[PDB]
Design a protein around this ligand. Sequence first.
Ligand SMILES: Cc1c(C(=O)O)cccc1N1CCNC1=O
Ligand SMILES: Cc1c(C(=O)O)cccc1N1CCNC1=O
Ligand SMILES: Cc1c(C(=O)O)cccc1N1CCNC1=O
Ligand SMILES: Cc1c(C(=O)O)cccc1N1CCNC1=O
Ligand SMILES: Cc1c(C(=O)O)cccc1N1CCNC1=O
Lengths: 279, 276, 276, 282, 279
Amino acid sequence: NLYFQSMSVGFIGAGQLAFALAKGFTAAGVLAAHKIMASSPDMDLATVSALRKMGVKLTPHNKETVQHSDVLFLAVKPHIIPFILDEIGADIEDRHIVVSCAAGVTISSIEKKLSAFRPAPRVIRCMTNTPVVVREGATVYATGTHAQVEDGRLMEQLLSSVGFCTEVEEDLIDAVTGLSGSGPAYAFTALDALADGGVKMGLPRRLAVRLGAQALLGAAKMLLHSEQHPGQLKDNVSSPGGATIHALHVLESGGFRSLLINAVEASCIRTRELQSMAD
Amino acid sequence: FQSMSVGFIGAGQLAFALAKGFTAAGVLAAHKIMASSPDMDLATVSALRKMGVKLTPHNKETVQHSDVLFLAVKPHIIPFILDEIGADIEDRHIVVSCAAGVTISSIEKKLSAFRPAPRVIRCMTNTPVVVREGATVYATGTHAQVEDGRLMEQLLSSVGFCTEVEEDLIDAVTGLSGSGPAYAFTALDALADGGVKMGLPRRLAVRLGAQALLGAAKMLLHSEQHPGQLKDNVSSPGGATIHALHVLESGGFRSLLINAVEASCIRTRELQSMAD
Amino acid sequence: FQSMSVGFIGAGQLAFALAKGFTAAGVLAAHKIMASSPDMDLATVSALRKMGVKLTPHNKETVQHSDVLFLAVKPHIIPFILDEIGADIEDRHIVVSCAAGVTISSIEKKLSAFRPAPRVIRCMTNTPVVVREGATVYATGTHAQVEDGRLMEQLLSSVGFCTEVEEDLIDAVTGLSGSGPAYAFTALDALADGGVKMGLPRRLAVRLGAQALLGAAKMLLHSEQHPGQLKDNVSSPGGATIHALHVLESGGFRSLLINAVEASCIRTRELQSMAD
Amino acid sequence: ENLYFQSMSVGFIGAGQLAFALAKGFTAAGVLAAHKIMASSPDMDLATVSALRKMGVKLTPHNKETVQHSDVLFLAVKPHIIPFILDEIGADIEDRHIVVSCAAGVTISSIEKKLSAFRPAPRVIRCMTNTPVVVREGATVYATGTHAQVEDGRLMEQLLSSVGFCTEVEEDLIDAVTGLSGSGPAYAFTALDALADGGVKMGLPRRLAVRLGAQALLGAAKMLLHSEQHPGQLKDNVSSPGGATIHALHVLESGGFRSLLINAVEASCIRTRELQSMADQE
Amino acid sequence: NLYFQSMSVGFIGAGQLAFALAKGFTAAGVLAAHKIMASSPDMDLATVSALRKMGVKLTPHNKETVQHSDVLFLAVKPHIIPFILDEIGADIEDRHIVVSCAAGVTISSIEKKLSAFRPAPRVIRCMTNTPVVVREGATVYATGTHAQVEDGRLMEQLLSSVGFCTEVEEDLIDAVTGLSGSGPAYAFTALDALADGGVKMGLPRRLAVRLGAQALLGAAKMLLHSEQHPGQLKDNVSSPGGATIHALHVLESGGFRSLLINAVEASCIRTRELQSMAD
Ligand SMILES: Cc1c(C(=O)O)cccc1N1CCNC1=O
Ligand SMILES: Cc1c(C(=O)O)cccc1N1CCNC1=O
Ligand SMILES: Cc1c(C(=O)O)cccc1N1CCNC1=O
Ligand SMILES: Cc1c(C(=O)O)cccc1N1CCNC1=O
Ligand SMILES: Cc1c(C(=O)O)cccc1N1CCNC1=O
């Protein structure tokens, strides 16, 4: 029964992540779409057309987003952020909470830009992912220097309505990006391949995609609701001499585990290295 | 345009491909094209003569003939060309650089020492312009007029796909569609070897493999659907195609093509860093 | 021909592709085509209705409507189809099997029990017939008349390449151009991933990669030259393309495509051995 | 013939494998008298020195004697020895000399820099050849230095053409040539040894497998050199559908055969450059 | 100064191998092209058009080749041989020497077919390669049951005019096929790759192809004229610490030698397995 009656939300950027969050927030009922405004340099994006359908207010002008909004999501590419902050810095007021969703972009760099216009900008850095669109996102956030205690509690309330949300120290966020920020792409790749495997063995493609996705969904839910180690749940499904343990062996023979470690590491390192070139 | 005069500095594979595509398209008569080369014995130069293109060993004569000037020389030769003909660039000229990696900044810097406001366009095209199915991107320079970009798009659209991009995308485009045809020629040779291994005559295997690739690419271009969806559409359960897809996956087929785009892009950037 | 009536048993991806190509080509009006399927809710069936193709759940009605009868069902369904409609085959009928691996002998054996001298043609086509760039081979059966092979070649030539082959080549053709589009869709997805990794927007990367493959395939088809010679022509010394070719070679890129043709061909043969 | 009646005196500083291969080739060609060649080495106990002796080549431990004897002076020592050689006999190079460096990686510029401190216009040519000059089937490229006369390049081409293919290139190609045809015979010797092993594994006597593999490679190379055709086209022409040859080509592809030969040319070229960059820093 | 004045040669099959041998024999001067006849089911082959240019007599009918010829080369695909022998078996005379060039096809299978029509067919089995076209072929042959001593000496004289030729026991020929029969294809692949390597390092393609081919030609000639082991010649070119030994290492690291062993083995096994399916 959550609802932020006194809150206006703006998205600078109207891409995949802005659409997912707006759809999540509306589907949760915590915000009405008409209290959400999004701006984009390209008003012909398919995400823009969809936001219009939901009732979200659209404008080409980032300044109008800022003037309309209390909570301002920066949902542009990381290299776009300094240009955004240059453009609207003089429009940031005391009432604004600036929530940066950009991968790698530090609270320090955002506060430094905005402090040139007005001291004490209220900045929160977050890393979320697109499954907020089905209210099963995974979000972490870190509060900036001038964020009030009520600011983070409020953002946790909002982002908890679309998935898991928790506060972290900012120096964990690049690693979170490699795990749950990039995570859904790893899963989509895995589901495409599992479906290909089902088709090879004779399943219709539609059934194979549905079964694979359901298997992944249920296994993740099992882990989330269990106090048990994932290796323990693996043991419970691996019947002696059976089909599952034979398949696990061929995963191990290809170094399956190391590829996923490789992936989290690669996404995290890229995230840091993008920011370091920015700075 | 009709009154438009075009010149090529460099008369190698790319200049021939472009001149052949332009004249096949009808947008340009061969007599309105002139080309120069340090080597007037190249096969590409003899072919251009058969088509009716004017040839010269002197780059200055090509410049004086031309309105649109294509630089189709190797990237390391561009600075030398610019030094040799920079004093001959007029206000009427549009200089279109085709060299991999060579930046608009480096070209404008060289030419601006002879005359300010050089109209410079950078493009990355590929050799299939010779059959009017090229892939071309271009970026306009500091002093390029709006009509200059539209003239370029009109000309290059006649021999394939053409769109304007920001210049910082062009090295990646080089790795993808600039080098792309070579990946496809390698693949077509291998697919033909495979057909021959399984009993097909070579001439038939080459024709079938090439037709298969053309038709698939055309399908994707004419479809709104994802390439994996099209792959799904043609992968019958338990069948031959899905068995073959598996063996490609087992060799990391996808990663090799990603590697290739990356390597070509990185080499393109690296060559320019050595230039500057 | 104009008076020619065509039927499809099976209304999946291949039947739609063929009907769409045939009607786009102009050789066949949609109203002279009829299709049947055990599942009248498939997307392919709804699309065929929009085009104006007649639909039915009863294979017998398709047979009675048709002069040329395409069997576009899965290979394991062919024997069942033949048992169900074998008594409805007339002398006027030409039965064109599209099923991977299914031999003319097995089809003639089934049908000859109902009426002697069935006119049977086996082909291997592919889905790019939907954009009139298919690759098709066919072999004529024991009782196929000379005009039957020329009618088939005329029809299938309207939607792509078509040539007659000896039947023992068809399983290899399946591995090459039958499964070929799927290899190309996989490659185009990966090439797009590569362009995206190097900074390109996805929509642009897909378009450029697909255009690059189309143009290269068209170049080879229009050239008398070897694919390695065309590769040589586009591999500038020390440049980006030759660097990218090396990384493909280092992963055994060529061998993977050979593997794929072989695996699809072998699976095609293996399925038929299980049939018989 | 016309080179013979020029009665050139040739010197080699360095009496190793390349000096012996060139001396053998030149004398077999009839362009030089063995006793009109002089070679020097700090190590007079090398086997190649003993072979040169038997040929009739004059040998001396004194590099100055080789310089004074010579009209054309080949520098055939290893690359790191070249700057010490140029220090030692730089004062003895005369205006009449053509100095031909065969050392991998060593630039004309580095040689002229040393020699220019003595006489002002040293005539320098850089070449990359290979040991098959010994059977007059070498692959040679050369580049002419700042003060090399046009007649010097022509003379060099005439001489080296007597022992194989020879052509002028810009100097910036020579490190790559080194990785390809300078090191190339070693790749072929490795390949011939392995093909012979494969012959032996399948039941052939070693002597026959060596002969047949070598004849196959020789004939294939000659076919290519005499054909206006792409090597892939020649490959297509011999690969019968479904046959033994295309099956063998597949297993070469599956091991990345092509990439290993590219790796080899690259590794030899890069090493050649790396040794020069080390010398030019010092 | 060799010349077979009293010899007519026929080729059944007019493909790559027949053209190479006819061009080799004519270039050697041992046969005039007008004393050579070739037949082919396809008179539009590019090889057929070239044979016509040399002056070789062409006919669609294998029977005419047999009637014209003394020495009859079977230069068709192996699976074509039994059909050829069925077609012309009744036309084989006492004067004919039948030289089969087909990979894998045994003397026993040929003699069995031809003996049904007339006893004591004179059969020689050979394995040659296309470099006979430049008179640098590599040929081995085995004499059949009814071949006279003069028959093999004659075929060795003829085939020696276009390259190396020697008699072997028939059970070596499948292995020879894997080594020198398929050998030139291995070399063409290697030369394409070496040229690619030269181009990568900055050489024009034309120069790289010429240098690579010359290097291979000279090295093979060096080995043929030396009494020394190929490893010894390798040692003579591998200067300590130098460029060549660095390149040899990277060949070894990829298992270069084992790939060539793999190749000879694969071609030999395929050759045997084709014949075993024939029998
Ligand atoms: C670019 C990006 C990555 C990436 O680098 O792949 C990963 C997670 C989120 C984001 N997003 C989305 C919107 N703005 C961002 O930074
Ligand atoms: C050299 C080159 C590459 C490369 O580096 O492989 C790639 C694409 C285009 C070009 N061209 C063609 C003419 N001038 C260029 O720069
Ligand atoms: C099943 C199939 C394969 C395969 O086995 O992957 C390959 C090519 C065509 C076909 N089709 C389509 C319709 N009926 C068939 O047999
Ligand atoms: C050392 C060397 C290599 C190598 O580095 O392997 C390659 C080619 C030639 C030479 N030679 C021979 C005499 N002096 C040289 O530099
Ligand atoms: C088919 C073939 C192979 C092979 O199987 O690749 C190898 C060597 C020779 C032959 N030839 C040529 C003519 N008739 C033959 O058998």
